[PDB]
Amino acid sequence: KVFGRCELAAAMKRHGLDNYRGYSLGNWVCAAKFESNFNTQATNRNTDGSTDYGILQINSRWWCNDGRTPGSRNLCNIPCSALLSSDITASVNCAKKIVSDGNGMNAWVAWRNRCKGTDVQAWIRGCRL
Ligand code: NA
């Protein structure tokens, strides 16, 4: 599914991301925009053989199982395919684990390079929430 901006903001809020670990809703919307262009079915293969999955491009080296990332972990206890669903539950619940690790949203390189420090509230401007 390719979400609209406000559509995703509303879904993320329903799924409990607004102010999760202190990160306002616009941070999560910005991160999704630059990670996946709001497409739940996004995938990208990394040079190390791991793959990033879903609207927040969650990586198989640590967070999910895909059966083809040798030596990796599955800390969200899910198949990586669950991160591609129209239903954002698995992506949200896993992102909550990830952001609760020590580096916060810096885990998402696109957040650090494109969202951090910017007017992230603009991503939710105008949306019914
Ligand atoms: Na894995």
What are the b/e assignments for 104-126, b being 16+ CB within 10 Å?
bbebbebbeeebbeeebeebbee
Amino acid identity at 17: L
Catalytic one among 7, 18, 48, 52? 52
What separation in Å is there between the alpha carbon of 61 and the centre of ligand 1? 5
What separation in Å is there between the alpha carbon of 125 and the centre of ligand 1? 36
Asked whether residue 48 is marked as a ligand-binding residue, the answer is no
Catalytic one among 7, 35, 66, 119? 35
Check if 52 is active-site: yes
Quick one: which of 79, 2, 69 has its CA closest to 42? 2
Q: Are 80 and 65 in contact (CB under 8 A)?
A: yes
What separation in Å is there between the alpha carbon of 50 and the centre of ligand 1? 8
How far apart (Å, rounded) are the C-alpha atoms in residues 73 and 63?
6
Q: Which domains does the chain have, with CATH numbers?
A: 1-129 (1.10.530.10)
Q: Are 26 and 121 in contact (CB under 8 A)?
A: yes
Check if 35 is active-site: yes
